[PDB]
Design a binder for this molecule. Structure first.
Ligand SMILES: [Mg+2]
Ligand SMILES: [Mg+2]
Ligand SMILES: [Mg+2]
Ligand SMILES: [Mg+2]
Ligand SMILES: [Mg+2]
Ligand SMILES: [Mg+2]
Ligand SMILES: [Mg+2]
Ligand SMILES: [Mg+2]
Ligand SMILES: [Mg+2]
Ligand SMILES: [Mg+2]
Ligand SMILES: [Mg+2]
Lengths: 50, 50, 417
RNA sequence: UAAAUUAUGGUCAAUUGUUAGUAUUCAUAUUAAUUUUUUUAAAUGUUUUAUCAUUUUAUAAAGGUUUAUUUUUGAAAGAUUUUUUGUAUAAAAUUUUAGGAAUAGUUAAUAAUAAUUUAUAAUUUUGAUUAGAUUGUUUUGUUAAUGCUAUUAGAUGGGUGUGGAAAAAUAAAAAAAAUAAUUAAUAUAUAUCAAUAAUAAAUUAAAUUAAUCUAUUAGUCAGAAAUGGAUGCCAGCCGUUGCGGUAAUUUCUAUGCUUUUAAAUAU
RNA sequence: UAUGCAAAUAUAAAAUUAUAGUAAUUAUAAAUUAUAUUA
């Protein structure tokens, strides 16, 4: 390496870092804009999903 | 977004083509990717053991 | 040392989703046309001789002095699935699965299937996506058909978009409101543009003018633009773009039409980075990893892996002519010891008489799936007795529906057993 | 006239107005300001001394200046027994008015000269002098940005000429020759030009010392939000196209209703 | 009908008018408009 004859491994030779073990299902997290009555999302109460 | 020339890999190409190894273990050891101390510090930052 | 963090770059649009790519653009994903060798290249025999040029010197390709036996390097396949990808993919393969019809894919994955009138022929079964419709403006123009006759025609400007990287805009002048809406929509699908999202926003400034409207599309940390221009740029799935129309916002001309046509024109003038890199005949920094396995087994080819068998080229020409075929009676009991007797039984390809060796039942099966005077055949004798074809099984008759004696039936089938 | 690597290094430039055929930085936007609010100022008597005197105590009055403002240590600092030195007043740059003409105790040499020394003098069209406006060369606002747009205030001639230096006639907030005082920063109700207060502007309570305050506006055609009732080209609205001709979602009034909640409006 | 006098479109410019304080703009070109002696 010191005389510059060592075969280079640089960050240029790296492809994508793959997802190997797939995490988990991300279940839908209830937000303030998901409500079965249009009332619970009011203008006087709810200013946004969170 | 760097654009390399066509022959950009030549130096490394003749370095690889002319390499030689005492045994085959030296040929592919897992750690040939690493030269400086910065390399060893990036490769093991995860295990607080190592 | 780069104080902008890639961690926080972007603009929340609230509910508006946009797509992002984990690595490359999805069209570039499945490469199967080069992998499974469907290309015109392979079909034209020409140039296949070139895999084998080492044959041009006979005593050499035996001797193996030169390490280059192959087109691109040391052998014909060193890395088949890696090397070639180092060219920027200008014309990616895209979606190649034919298991359904184009219209079935279209039907399932796209709302666009429900509105067959709004789409031109070239795009008809071609879309897998859902499109949003945004109506920018309605307006009224007077249309004079004659010096007395006057009609009120209306005028639509809208843009179709899907945040998955595809949008388009249209405008039209028609008699009714609904009419101009539909017209504008098919005019917008005629003009559809797409954007390469590998880069997620323009990497250089685009300075371009629509008619009288000077537009600047430049790289930004997030999306910054007029509300309308902004969700137009969101319709393409741009995270990092930012864009400005006409210097000062008060500058003439300014119409809703102008605002739309401007940003669409600008985006239509944008060049992808890969395209730029190929344009100069150069290798992009992003695509170099593909060369790695190649470069790897250059390094690793020393020693035995570089060695070829002395004397042997791998090309073995035919010399003699070999035929092992046999007359049927010879192969009737040929494989009895290796396998069971009657080895070739119902085999149509491997026998000149497909029905020989068969026991009566299996012979009857074939006709069974297959299906003039006052005489009774044995067929209707069975129908009036109600025995079908199965009950006769110890009797030499196979075809019940022929008019012939039992002895005839015996002699016709005799060679079979 | 060749590429380069021992690989992201030398530390963030990044632009958001709903328009009305077209050409041209020009109405309605944000930020910054004036409109707009008494949480930072303040009262008269300076003071020693050897006595009618003599020592100490040096740039906020006005006037309007654009080739313009420049200086010492001999005072004090300041230390030895007495004579102690030299360096300074000068210049160079940057200088405004839409449409432009002459200015003048006057230049240079002589010299401690000349209200009448000598000379073919000096300033000006490369913009003078008068005259208007104006407090000059680290200070602001806007902006991604060469820009555009601010910056106060303070040196106004001489005439017994003191003093180191004229800066010398109310208007401090500079301890002024014995330690006045430091347990002080609080100053009541005045001013000048500054100094951005609607400080969780609305539900669980203030690890206080409970002291100041009782606090509201807009719109309602286009573009979030409408109905009655009047009115009838009138009265009136008007950021803007424009509205008002008995049915006005654009005027007035009543009631509701709308707002993304430090206000509308004007400059 | 070029012996006196006489600079002057051939473009160096910042929205129209207006002697450079007046009004709020102005200017602009191809849609549309029935009779011109063709076998
Ligand atoms: Mg090298
Ligand atoms: Mg305008
Ligand atoms: Mg003064
Ligand atoms: Mg003056
Ligand atoms: Mg000067
Ligand atoms: Mg001077
Ligand atoms: Mg005097
Ligand atoms: Mg509305
Ligand atoms: Mg009103
Ligand atoms: Mg009435
Ligand atoms: Mg009404």
């Amino acid at each position: 390496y010191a005389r510059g004859q060592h075969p280079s491994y640089d960050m240029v030779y790296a492809g994508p870092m793959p997802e190997i073990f797939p995490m988990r299902r991300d279940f839908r997290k209830p937000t303030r804009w998901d409500f079965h009555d249009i009332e619970k999302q009011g203008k006087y109460r709810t200013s946004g999903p969170y | 977004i760097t654009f390399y020339s066509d022959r950009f890999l030549f130096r490394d190409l003749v370095n690889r083509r002319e390499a030689s190894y005492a045994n085959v273990w030296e040929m592919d050891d897992p750690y040939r990717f690493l030269q400086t101390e910065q390399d060893y510090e990036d490769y093991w930052g995860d295990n607080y053991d190592v | 040392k780069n104080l902008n963090s890639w961690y926080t770059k972007g603009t929340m649009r609230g509910g508006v989703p946009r797509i992002y790519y984990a690595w490359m653009r999805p069209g570039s994903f499945t490469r199967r046309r080069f992998e499974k060798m469907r290309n015109p290249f392979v079909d034209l025999e020409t140039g296949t001789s070139l895999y084998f040029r080492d044959t041009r010197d006979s005593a050499e390709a035996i001797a193996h002095a030169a390490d280059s036996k192959g087109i691109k390097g040391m052998d014909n396949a060193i890395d088949l699935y890696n090397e070639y990808r180092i060219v920027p993919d200008l014309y990616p393969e895209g979606f190649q699965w034919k298991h359904k019809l184009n219209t079935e894919y279209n039907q399932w994955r796209s709302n666009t299937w429900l509105t067959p009138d709004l789409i031109p022929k070239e795009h008809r079964g071609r879309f897998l996506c859902n499109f949003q419709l945004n109506i920018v403006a309605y307006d009224m123009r007077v249309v004079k058909f004659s010096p007395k006759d006057h009609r009120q025609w209306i005028y639509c400007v809208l843009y179709v978009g899907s945040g998955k990287g595809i949008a388009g805009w249209g405008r039209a002048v028609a008699p009714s409101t609904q009419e101009a809406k539909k017209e504008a929509i098919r005019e917008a699908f005629s003009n559809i543009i797409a954007v390469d999202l590998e880069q997620e926003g323009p990497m250089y400034p685009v300075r371009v003018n629509a008619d009288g409207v000077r537009v600047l599309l430049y790289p930004a940390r997030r999306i910054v633009a007029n509300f309308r221009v902004a969700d137009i740029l969101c319709a393409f799935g741009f995270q990092h773009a930012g864009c400005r129309i006409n210097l000062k916002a008060t500058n003439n001309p300014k119409s809703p039409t102008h605002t739309v046509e401007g940003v669409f024109e600008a985006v239509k003038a944008l060049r992808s980075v890969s395209e730029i890199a190929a344009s100069r005949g150069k290798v992009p920094h992003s695509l170099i990893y593909n060369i790695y396995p190649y470069l790897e087994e250059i390094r690793r080819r020393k020693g035995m892996m570089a060695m070829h068998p002395p004397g042997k080229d791998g090309l073995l020409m035919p010399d003699r002519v070999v035929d092992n075929r046999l007359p049927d009676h010879l192969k009737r009991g040929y494989y009895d010891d290796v396998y069971w007797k009657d080895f070739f039984a119902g085999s149509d390809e491997h026998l000149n008489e497909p029905r020989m060796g068969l026991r009566g039942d299996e012979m009857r099966r074939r006709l069974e799936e297959a299906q003039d005077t006052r005489r009774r055949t044995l067929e209707d004798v069975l129908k009036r007795l109600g025995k079908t074809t199965r009950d006769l099984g110890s009797i030499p008759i196979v075809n019940p529906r022929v008019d012939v004696g039992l002895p005839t039936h015996i002699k016709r089938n005799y060679q079979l057993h």
